[PDB]
């Protein structure tokens, strides 16, 4: 808790749905947003901060709260958009040999700044005396180890708590979320959303020789004509779906009522039957 990691993770597809099946977590409270909508929001970089506290101290990890650990080792402001993921680890972090390894900085002068790490080891000076380093009646060790033992009960067990702080500065976002894809239908009147640019039409096999760096493809107008699939490296021509005009030929509503229909721009195969020019 006095020296916690600050892992800056970015440039990936953060699949938070996988985190629900990695380890049997006991706390997945996210204050900012919902986990379902979290996979559809872009972010610049996530700050992972992990530490180990007791069971009765997990309640102190909140966006604004006092306590022996909330204002002395790690404090969160009232804007935390991440989660407070935590889980018990009383399977490998508790052996009967003396657990004089951790600490929680029982002594302090004032509340630390939110999201600050104070890696210090100087002797706590309780005023009214210049302590150049001594341990008696005026200046003591500001650090104190825990008493984690396997033959204990829940509440005073090693609980690993990891928070994921989110931020959005004036920089392009890297971590957005894992995309989704469906089957690639053949030539048919369908809708397509290939990597951004959307549209409706028919996807046929194209013979164009695209460059190894060009993805899209246009014409004399500002409309996409051919596109390459961003997950199989295959070019496909986009021809707009079959539309046209409909004319009615009528000999006159005075001798008969039979009429003929003329579909313009149709190949009598994408609507007796007569194919004219």
């Amino acid at each position, epitope marked *: 808790v006095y020296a916690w990691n600050r892992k800056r993770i970015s440039n990936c597809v953060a699949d938070y749905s996988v985190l629900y099946n990695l380890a049997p977590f006991f706390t997945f409270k996210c204050y900012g947003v919902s986990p379902t909508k979290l996979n559809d929001l872009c972010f610049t970089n996530v700050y992972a901060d992990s530490f180990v506290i*007791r069971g*009765d*101290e997990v*309640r*102190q990890i909140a966006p604004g709260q*006092t*306590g*022996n650990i909330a*204002d002395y080792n790690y404090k969160l402001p009232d804007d935390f958009t991440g989660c407070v993921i935590a889980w018990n680890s009383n399977k490998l972090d508790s052996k009967v040999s003396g657990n004089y390894n951790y600490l929680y900085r*029982l*002594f*302090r*002068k*004032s*509340n630390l700044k939110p999201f600050e790490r104070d890696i210090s080891t100087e002797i706590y000076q*309780a*005023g*009214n005396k210049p302590c150049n380093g001594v341990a*008696g*009646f*005026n200046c*003591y060790f500001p650090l*104190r180890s*825990y*008493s984690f033992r396997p*033959t*204990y*009960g829940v*509440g*005073h067990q090693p609980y690993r708590v990891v928070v994921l702080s989110f931020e959005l500065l004036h920089a392009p976002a890297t971590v957005c979320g894992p995309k989704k894809s469906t089957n690639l239908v053949k030539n048919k009147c369908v809708n397509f959303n290939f990597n951004g640019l959307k549209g409706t039409g028919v996807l046929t096999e194209s013979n164009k020789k695209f460059l190894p760096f060009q993805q899209f493809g246009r014409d004399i107008a500002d409309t996409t004509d051919a596109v390459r699939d961003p997950q199989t490296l295959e070019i496909l021509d986009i021809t707009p779906c079959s539309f046209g005009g409909v004319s009615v030929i009528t000999p006159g509503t005075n001798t008969s009522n039979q009429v003929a229909v003329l579909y313009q721009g149709v190949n009598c195969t994408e609507v007796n039957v007569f194919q004219t020019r």
Partner: single-chain antibody
Amino acid sequence: VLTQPPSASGSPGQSVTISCTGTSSDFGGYNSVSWYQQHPGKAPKLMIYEVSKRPSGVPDRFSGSKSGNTASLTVSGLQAEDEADYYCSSYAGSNNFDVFGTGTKVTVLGGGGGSEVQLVESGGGLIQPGGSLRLSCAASGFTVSSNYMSWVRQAPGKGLEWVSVIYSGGSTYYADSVKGRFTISRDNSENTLYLQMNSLRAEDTAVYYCARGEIQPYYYYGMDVWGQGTTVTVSS
């Protein structure tokens, strides 16, 4: 709420071995069970904080091992003339007051801090019911603005209980008895540290004690020094 024997007088100094049951656990986290010897008149004095390693004092009271689920403070062979009350502290859970125990009469016979840092109070003689009275414990020695001090009150007949806890600079936790009607406010950072009554509810008639160290999360702090209390004597 703890379990302590009402009295203990049979076999003086041979098989007394008082303790405090009613834990039903492993003393929570830090296995630090303190023992206070409240004497009538002056303030109580610390006897032992851990299960062993007694502080500078009488060496005939040690071996406070945690047998079963209770700390059995071995008091046999100490003496045969004492009139005081032994109190034990446990239940170190997060934000849990009333860590003291009931009045245990450990009088073996029955019939037969001053210059350390400082000891001052306000002297609340004939306190008007309600209002706002301030009590200070100005210490010219240890810093009154850096250490972790507390306030514990006790009434005639009833035992002690945690009434006020204040951390270094950013915590103002209150006990469950006041539930909010008590507002702790630190005085000047280099003069003293006082309290505030804020319209008591006729239950604050007990005498106060401003301790320089925490009770349940007790630290060695070099020496445990207390101060004499004053009678509120409410007139509601």
